[PDB]
Design a protein around this ligand. Structure first.
Ligand code: SF4
Ligand code: F3S
Length: 106
């Protein structure tokens, strides 16, 4: 499965949803997650993230391993998103900044 990690938080560009064939992205107030049992590992979303927050599960950075289980869990409670929308208002302010996990809204 692929994994949305820290830099999506407070950016939420949603460009990634355009290319998923199986529609497995689920939407939070200020983050997206990939449903691990639905992702077919086509790797198509990851060139599309402007914030470069998507990784193959096995390539998720050591310091961002928490995101793997987070994606699994929130994928059960969040709504499915299928169309691209506007990025969060302050997206480019928050892009490239580290430790945005602290601001995750559920
Ligand atoms: S690897 Fe493919 S199936 Fe998975 S979330 Fe990405 S675009 Fe979708
Ligand atoms: S910022 Fe997030 S909404 Fe997608 S386009 Fe990137 S994983």
């Amino acid at each position: 499965a692929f994994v949305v990690t820290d830099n999506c938080i407070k950016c939420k560009c949603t460009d990634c949803v355009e290319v998923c064939p199986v529609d497995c992205f689920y939407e939070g107030p200020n983050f997206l997650v990939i449903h691990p049992d639905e992702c077919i590992d086509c790797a198509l979303c990851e060139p599309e993230c402007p914030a470069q927050a998507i990784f193959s599960e096995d390539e998720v950075p050591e310091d961002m391993q928490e995101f793997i289980q987070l994606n699994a869990e929130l994928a059960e409670v969040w709504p499915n998103i299928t169309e691209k929308k506007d990025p969060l208002p302050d997206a480019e302010d928050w892009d490239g900044v580290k430790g945005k996990l602290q601001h995750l809204e559920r």
